[PDB]
Amino acid sequence: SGAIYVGNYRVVNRHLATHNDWANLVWEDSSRDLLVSSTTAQGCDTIARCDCQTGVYYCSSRRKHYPVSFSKPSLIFVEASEYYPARYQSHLMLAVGHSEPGDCGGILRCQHGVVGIVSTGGNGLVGFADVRDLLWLDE
Numbered sequence: 001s002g003a004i005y006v007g008n009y010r011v012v013n014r015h016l017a018t019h020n021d022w023a024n025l026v027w028e029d030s031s032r033d034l035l036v037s038s039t040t041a042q043g044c045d046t047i048a049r050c051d052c053q054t055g056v057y058y059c060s061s062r063r064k065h066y067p068v069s070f071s072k073p074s075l076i077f078v079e080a081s082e083y084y085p086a087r088y089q090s091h092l093m094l095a096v097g098h099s100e101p102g103d104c105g106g107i108l109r110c111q112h113g114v115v116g117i118v119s120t121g122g123n124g125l126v127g128f129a130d131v132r133d134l135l136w137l138d139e
């Protein structure tokens with residue numbers, strides 16, 4: 001589980017969004033596993049605006065933050081699961097690291113701020129849904 005709180009927005013994995021998120025929906029994209037909903041209070045996270053390929057992510061299944069190298073956002077095949085059939089997920093970045101389904105929502109950050117959240121995993125890999133192209137999150 002996990003979310004990014006920037007301004008009056010809440011960014012979560014779309015497969016983990018709640019009633020309030022859908023009711024106060026701002027934007028969603030199934031092909032990116034992302035959902036943004038409006039909030040009453042202001043958040044304090046800063047979104048990174050950069051091309052960094054190194055950062056640190058939180059792994060809840062290990063209670064540990066791991067430094068990682070990650071690929072650029074891409075269209076990657078994601079095997080079928082209980083939340084989606086087999087499909088290509090867009091704006092996805094992979095790293096070699098531990099990831100379990102309950103790890104989705106864990107933040108990936110660089111020196112510039114939040115890069116994205118855990119979305120995929122298994123086979124000794126971990127995938128992150130990029131949020132750095134979502135410029136409207138800053139306004």
Ligand SMILES: NC(=O)[C@H]1CCC(=O)N([C@@H]2CCCc3ccccc32)C1
Pocket residue numbers: 015033078081083084089099100101102103104119120121122
């Ligand atoms: N974005 C998606 O299509 C995800 C939906 C929920 C979900 O569990 N996953 C995968 C399943 C395989 C193991 C695994 C480990 C860690 C994180 C995520 C997953 C894919």
Ligand SMILES: [Zn+2]
Pocket residue numbers: 048049050051052110111112113
């Ligand atoms: Zn950066």
